[PDB]
Amino acid sequence: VQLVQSGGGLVQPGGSLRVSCAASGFSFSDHDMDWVRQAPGKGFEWVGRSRNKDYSSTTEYAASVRGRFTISRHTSEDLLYLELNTVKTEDTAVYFCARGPHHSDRSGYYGGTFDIWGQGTMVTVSSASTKGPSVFPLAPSSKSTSGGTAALGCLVKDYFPEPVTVSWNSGALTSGVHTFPAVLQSSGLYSLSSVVTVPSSSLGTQTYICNVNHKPSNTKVDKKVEPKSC
Amino acid sequence: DIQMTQSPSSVSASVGDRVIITCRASQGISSWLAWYQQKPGRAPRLLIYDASTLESGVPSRFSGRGSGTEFTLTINSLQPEDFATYYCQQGNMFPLTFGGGTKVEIKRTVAAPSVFIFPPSDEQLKSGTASVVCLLNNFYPREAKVQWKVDNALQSGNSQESVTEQDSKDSTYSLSSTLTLSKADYEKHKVYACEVTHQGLSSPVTKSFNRGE
């Protein structure tokens, strides 16, 4: 049972954007599917529900988003859509798709709880423009070597909007990696650092590639961080 | 339409300690309550449904009780991996409504950070910009201070710091601080240093390097 989200990114105020979610491992038709949003540094708020094929009015929304948002489903492909028409500044958030009760669940007519959520999709409302990031190696050295360890990383700079994903060696290096939050620079562009501390003895034998994804600009860079020669 | 009051907003405990969180509903929701755990950056996870029913896969230390307008979620033996923000959800009537959330953090043994400095790569230098990075690694508590000095001239306005959530293994913190100069202002000066203050250090520590080396 899974939920994969997609879409999102930047959107001019008063514009439109469609956010989607794909579901596998279950009979999509037989379940209610809700949309929930989290404002940055805030709690969850329910955005609405798409009903499970036993309803003629197949949708419910919260009053706050009721005149601007439309929730729909694909005719046959197991997809959930959330189209944010005439977006406002207060609609910037992470939108999660979640799964609700089954059509045989007695509680589901008036409400219900979830069990599986999607990873989330970031919807940023701004009139800036998309920028791909620059990826710079933070090479390991005596300055970055402590005892029995070295620290190397990536500097992902001058990108917009959020977010950026960083992984190390295709996700196989998950020990000691620290992906830092992004800071909004003076220019209006973000910057984040990704460091991983590894054993010094492997720096001439082991190969270190940081993977950087910026889906909004469709930019992926797999950077070789290497010990400086000197 | 149905208000949810969750307390506490923030909790700190040690490993092995009992944490309790309550939830208050404006009207009775019977047993239509669920509890979720959001580890930062990830998706929420269902922990409890039907007020007290533990969802398969969840450690038996979690336990929800209550009904009507008063609910709780205990965590008996706190583990470092149990760090997240916890939310109650009401399923009795539309709109589906959540609590404000409770953040759970560990209390651990004070740890001093490792300090690492990173000069600008020649790649970033050919583009005309210089960025020096300072890294503070695996410290506790979260307060820390980072002062950039260029030729022993302290700096403000050209720097930005960032901090991580607690680790799910050792409950420690990390911090990067980035100093952004131009290729001109950078190449004018010689020594670039980073002075870290923490309570796990009896002395501030300073990592320097000289430009071009």
Numbering used by the authors:
A (entry chain A): 2 to 52, 52A, 52B, 52C, 53 to 82, 82A, 82B, 82C, ...
B (entry chain B): 1 to 213
Question: Would you copy out the relevant sentences from the publication that reported this structure?
Answer:
The HCMV Pentamer, composed of gH, gL, UL128, UL130, and UL131A, enhances entry into epithelial, endothelial, and myeloid cells by interacting with the cell surface receptor neuropilin 2 (NRP2). The other critical tropism-determining complex is the HCMV Pentamer, which is composed of glycoproteins UL128, UL130, and UL131A and the same gH and gL proteins that comprise the bulk of the HCMV Trimer. This elongated heteropentamer mediates tropism for endothelial and epithelial cells by binding to neuropilin 2 (NRP2) and triggering the viral fusion protein, gB, to facilitate entry into host cells.
Model building was facilitated by high-resolution crystal structures of unbound Fabs (1-103: 1.9 Å, 1-32: 2.1 Å, 2-18: 2.8 Å, and 2-25: 2.5 Å), which were then used as reference restraints and lightly refined as a part of the complex. This junction where UL128 meets UL131A does not fit into one of the preexisting antigenic sites, but rather overlaps with both sites 2 and 5 of IR1 (16, 38), thus representing a previously undescribed neutralizing epitope. All four of these antibodies effectively neutralized HCMV when incubated with virions in a standard neutralization assay, with 2-18 exhibiting the most potent neutralization. No such decrease in potency was observed for 2-18 Fab. The similarity in epitopes between these two mAbs implies that the decrease in 2-25 Fab potency can be attributed to the lower affinity of 2-25 compared to 2-18, suggesting that 2-25 requires the avidity effects of bivalency to neutralize effectively. As expected based on the results of our NRP2 competition assay, the two most potently neutralizing mAbs that we examined, 2-18 and 2-25, do not appear to compete with NRP2 a1a2b1b2 based on our structural analysis. Although it is possible that 2-18 and 2-25 compete with the C-terminal MAM domain, this seems unlikely based on the position of the C terminus of b2 (50).
